Write a protein that binds this ligand. Sequence first.
Ligand code: HEM
Length: 212
Amino acid sequence: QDLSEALKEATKEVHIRAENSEFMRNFQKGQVSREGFKLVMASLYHIYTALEEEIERNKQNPVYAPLYFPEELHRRAALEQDMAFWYGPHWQEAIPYTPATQHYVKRLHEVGGTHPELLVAHAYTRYLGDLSGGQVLKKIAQKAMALPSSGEGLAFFTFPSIDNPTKFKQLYRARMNTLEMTPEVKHRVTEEAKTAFLLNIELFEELQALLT
Ligand code: HEM
């Protein structure tokens, strides 16, 4: 069984739970406000910063290298633009760093520094989602908060280097299938993907509570 199919199969159940989280459920209803949106994007800023730091650390490592797509996928730069938009010129010392966000970042550094063969699970979970449901969320956000079609405030959801998200995802899945695979690595990569999804769910549950 190809890794791409193993991952989709392994995370299909938890994905349902994730997309139905209270925060996401509200977001999908169009019920999303500046306060809540700023909290989640600031949290993603920290998460992608950690993820991409570990990707750079392991860019030449065979267990990840085939999936090294900084130009097409990396979100750090985009998130910095969004942080300046939502939090202003000095967003650096204004943005929050919640406990659940810190927990996610902690696991990312553990994986990147100690278990790099599992990094693919984290890139898969975040990037492929951004190119899927994230695109629907972008449209909901624009309508709900009156964000311009020009993109300001939603740079994170925009991929100027990817003409067709659907085609790119197919390319990415194919590339994941070229990674050196053994039963041990395949088993743990799918388990780590489940963990990645749980870290996201816990983040959303935390943000929803903070807003409430
Ligand atoms: C806001 C609720 C969400 C919606 C509407 C949604 C919807 C979708 C849709 C329609 C697909 C299928 C795309 C395809 O076949 O190419 C998809 C795939 C995916 N989503 Fe979500 N999603 C949501 C939340 C999430 C969350 C919270 C995560 C985890 C950070 C996530 C990660 C993924 C991943 C990793 C895939 C790719 C699965 C695969 O092809 O193997 N999604 N999502």
